[PDB]
From a paper:
NF-κB is a family of evolutionarily conserved transcription factors that provide stimulus-dependent temporal control over target gene expression. Despite its original characterization as a repressor of target gene transcription, the NF-κB p50 homodimer was subsequently shown to be an active transcription factor through its association with other nuclear factors, such as the IκBζ co-activator protein. By virtue of its low affinity for cytoplasmic IκB protein inhibitors, p50 accumulates in the nucleus of resting cells, where it is a binding target for the transcriptional co-activator IκBζ. The resulting crystallographic model reveals the well-characterized DNA-binding NF-κB RHR (also commonly referred to as the “RHD”) composed of an amino-terminal domain (murine p50 residues 39–239) and a short interdomain linker (residues 240–247) followed by the dimerization domain (residues 248–350).
To address these questions, we engineered a “Test” DNA containing the core κB-like sequence 5′-GGGGAATTCCCC-3′. We embedded this core sequence within ends of different sequence and length so as to impose asymmetry in crystal packing and unambiguous identification of DNA orientation during model-building and crystallographic refinement and determined the X-ray crystal structure of the resulting 16-mer DNA in complex with p50 at 3.0 Å resolution. The resulting crystallographic model clearly reveals that p50 binds the Test κB-like DNA with 11-bp spacing. Moreover, since the Test DNA does not contain a central A:A mismatch, the binding is inherently asymmetric. Base-specific contacts between p50:Test and p50:IL-6 are largely conserved. One notable difference is that, in the p50:Test complex, Lys241 from subunit A binds to the available fourth G base, as expected. Lys241 from subunit B contacts the T base of a T:A bp, just as it does in the p50:IL-6 complex. This is significant because, if the p50 homodimer bound DNA with 12-bp spacing, then it could accommodate both triplet G binding by the loop L1 residues and a second favored Lys241:G interaction by subunit B. Rather, p50 binds to the Test κB DNA with 11-bp spacing. Therefore, the p50:Test complex X-ray crystal structure strongly suggests that 11-bp spacing to κB DNA is the preferred binding mode by the NF-κB p50 homodimer. Furthermore, it illustrates how the preferred binding of a two-fold symmetric p50 homodimer dimer to 11-bp within a two-fold symmetric κB DNA necessarily introduces asymmetry into an otherwise symmetrical complex.
Author numbering:
A (entry chain A), B (entry chain B): 39 to 350
Write the structure that this text describes.
DNA sequence: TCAGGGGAATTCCCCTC
DNA sequence: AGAGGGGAATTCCCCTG
């Protein structure tokens, strides 16, 4: 039967979540292949069905238990945190550009979560899957307006109080839900929604972009233990590593880490370290290796920089 | 007649202002001559008068107009921002230890300021000097009993709205006011108040501590621009200078600033720059020069570190 | 501009005596 | 095991191109 397939996922890292105070129009959530000039965006595709339909996007949690996220989606076609756009009549592919991720305050988690749960219940956008199964009977029953009862508000507040202590404000996910038309033509037939890759805030120190801005000495001796200063982006002294590596044997790898202490990490932006020992200390020609910044917890690679080992 | 003399002023820089959230036990305001083990505190002395008296201390602003400051003084003898202590019979020496400077939020400045202005009018603590000259008639009538009128509250609120946007939250001053007894014995005869030195918050980037944490090359050549990386504390790229200096017996004033661009200042904590040319390029012996970080606005001295120029 | 980025203000938490 | 600081994370502000 018909389903929804994510053609291009959003970029997991590099995007910066912004609060209401930071202002508007600061960038759109880019695609996984959104290099400079080759600006791409998250794309989905409704398969096994040809014709006009609608696609909604909502923010969900990163944990095993999928639930609504207090963060919102801001931009055009987005109202109250949900972005709704009509798919092409023939191009069953849908792209999402100019999507910002509104970061909520920790104190304003409960308030925003409850408000957007109320919205998701009045609009019937997967009420039982994200809030609570007790309200999984509101699959757009009726046309348009769907006033809520008193017990339904009770369930909303119960789900909100329980999901406040379990929400990571630094990571979100995209849930794409497709809606196929019915008899009257209104988009109401809901197929299985699909969750996107995890989206990590750039303001989170454990998931930012690892970049080697500058190095004082770009070429050391094959012996090693030479002091080098590396100016970098924001890194955590207890969760940072400087890795020299070279591809060898056409398949094999050579690693080697700089010997530095967390005290040598100067205020998250600079590291004074010492070069490790190379393989062939009895080398004859200067060998070329790459250097990167690797997070010990995430094992995330920084963009490598050239480095050279010279004999003595 | 009798006056009040500040024996030891507080240390102008080095102390960090703290908000209500940061807690209570983060340090006491040290004196200008304080050091480790030699723990000193701001002290004053009532001169030309022997006997019991009273000394109050209040926070005032730095600027042309001396006025109450939204920041408060926290501690034992301090209540609602004013620290009152009896000089004791025949002691006449007054010390002020365990004094913290409560940093208020920008949003809650006005609320606090007006709240402390009314108090200064109800208690008669220099109302015309600190609040507004129109209220320079509020002395000695009552120490709490004298409720204020409506026009007085209008003047207080006007002074508060005008001085909220005119207050520097990063610098304060201490005002000591002495009170001699009268016939009935109540301390009400006000002596001339004395203002202390300016106290600059260490967490303010324009008044922080200038420290040379690390240098890539600690000895360069007299030839000229050699690139060296300097790891430092928080400095402002548009208001920072790297000064090479040497005191000599022939006038002994040689200045010379490192050739760096504000772009070379890596995230306020590192500067990649080039050493300037010293005098006597045709030297024969290695000459020693010292290095500092000098703030462009304040011309404040950093802790010097050794450096040397060798010929070619 | 809209797309970013740096940095300041504010809150929270850890390291060394 | 706690005060004194200091660093780091979380929100907020606004400058640049």
């Amino acid at each position: 039967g018909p389903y929804l397939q994510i053609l291009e996922q959003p970029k997991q890292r590099g995007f910066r979540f912004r609060y209401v105070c930071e202002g508007p129009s600061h960038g759109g959530l880019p695609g996984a292949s959104s290099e400079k000039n080759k600006k791409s965006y998250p794309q989905v595709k409704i398969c096994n069905y040809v014709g006009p339909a609608k696609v909604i996007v909502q923010l969900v949690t990163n944990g095993k238990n999928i639930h609504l996220h207090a963060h919102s989606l801001v931009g055009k076609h987005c109202e109250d945190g949900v972005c709704t756009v009509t798919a092409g009549p023939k191009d069953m592919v849908v792209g999402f550009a100019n999507l910002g991720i509104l970061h909520v305050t920790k104190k304003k988690v409960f308030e925003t979560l409850e408000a957007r749960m109320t919205e998701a219940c009045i609009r019937g956008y997967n009420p039982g899957l994200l809030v609570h199964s007790d309200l999984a009977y509101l699959q757009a029953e009726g046309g348009g307006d769907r006033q809520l009862t008193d017990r339904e508000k009770e369930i909303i507040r119960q789900a909100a109080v329980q999901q406040t202590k379990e929400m990571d404000l630094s990571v979100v996910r995209l849930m794409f839900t497709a809606f196929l038309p019915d008899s009257t033509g209104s988009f109401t037939r809901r197929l299985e929604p699909v969750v996107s890759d995890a989206i990590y805030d750039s303001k989170a120190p454990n998931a930012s972009n690892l970049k080697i801005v500058r190095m004082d000495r770009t070429a050391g001796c094959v012996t090693g233990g030479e002091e080098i200063y590396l100016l970098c982006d924001k890194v955590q002294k207890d969760d940072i590593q400087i890795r020299f590596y070279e591809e060898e044997e056409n398949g094999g790898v050579w690693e080697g880490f700089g010997d530095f202490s967390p005290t040598d990490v100067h205020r998250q932006f600079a590291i004074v370290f010492k070069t490790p020992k190379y393989k062939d200390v009895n080398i004859t020609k200067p060998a070329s290796v790459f250097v990167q910044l690797r997070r010990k917890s995430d094992l995330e690679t920084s963009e490598p920089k050239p480095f050279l080992y010279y004999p003595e």
